[PDB]
Structure 1
Amino acid sequence: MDIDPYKEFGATVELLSFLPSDFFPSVRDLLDTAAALYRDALESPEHCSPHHTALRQAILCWGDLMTLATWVGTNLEDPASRDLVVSYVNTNVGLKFRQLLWFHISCLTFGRETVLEYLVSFGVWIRTPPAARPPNAPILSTLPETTVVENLYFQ
């Protein structure tokens, strides 16, 4: 099968690939943030949303990879090679999970449309030559809960 984990969420692997690897927080920091903001939802008996369901699996999958990588490492006769398999996972699959965790955590806070627009905004900014672009990166931020039109309507 050819399954793109972003496709049911309105995105693609190629679109997440538009961002440089340096854009994404680390796996540990994504996992810490998922816990700080969404632990209760993620641990609840309710689906909550497709993003929650996917994020739960992504978190556990990283755990599966690290548990396997740690176990083999303990079996490597060279004690200096203890985290060699763990390093292998980070090198070849770490970026994939950073993209995926970032996507779901961000979508849960900002909504798909805002996240996808930000992906484009940053990817265009980082491809503009540094001496020709605004010094600071674009900012990821939430939409207003109420529009100016609605606010003025109820004056």
Structure 2
Amino acid sequence: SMDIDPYKEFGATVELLSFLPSDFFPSVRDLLDTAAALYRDALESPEHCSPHHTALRQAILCWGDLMTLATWVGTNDPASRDLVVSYVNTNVGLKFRQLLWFHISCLTFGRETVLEYLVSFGVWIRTPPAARPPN
């Protein structure tokens, strides 16, 4: 195979994004709604806009396909077609939660802010509750 990192050209890495815990990311539904509310305009645009836009467009579309597949599985066993769709939110979901979050956040607050923040938050959430400064 090849070894491409989605975050590489954006000055980050898969390792770095996994530094944030899995329960810090919004939902996929919420992230898609937010992208729409903040960016539908530019996302549906024919202008490139920015590399972030180009990526996010593909991320959204890709989540599209993944679901259409989990849909088409459950529309083709109540404990099996239900546990297939469960795997998606388990695994890929985290993947997209990260990736959507990264791109929306980078468009909304700046790439640099999103990286400063991500490290601070990982350090901070790993400090045990006992001694952790104010939320």
1:91-127 Cα shifts (integer Å, max 9, x gaps) = 1211110000000000001111000000011101101
Match of 1:114 in 2: 113
1: CA distance between counterparts of 2:86 and 2:62?
16
1: CA distance between counterparts of 2:42 and 2:83?
34
Structure 1, unpaired ranges of 5+: 136-154
Is contact 1:70–1:85 with CA below 8 Å preserved after alignment? no
1:7-57 Cα shifts (integer Å, max 9, x gaps) = 000000000010000111011111110011001000011110000000000
Q: Offset of 1:80 from its aligned partner?
A: 4.5
Q: How many residues align?
A: 134
Structure 1 or 2, whichever has the larger Rg, is: 1
User: Identity rate of aligned residues, in percent?
Assistant: 99
Q: State the TM-score, normalized to the length of structure 1.
A: 0.83
1: CA distance between counterparts of 2:84 and 2:53?
29
Is contact 1:27–1:94 with CA below 8 Å preserved after alignment? yes
Match of 1:141 in 2: none
2: CA distance between counterparts of 1:64 and 1:90?
14
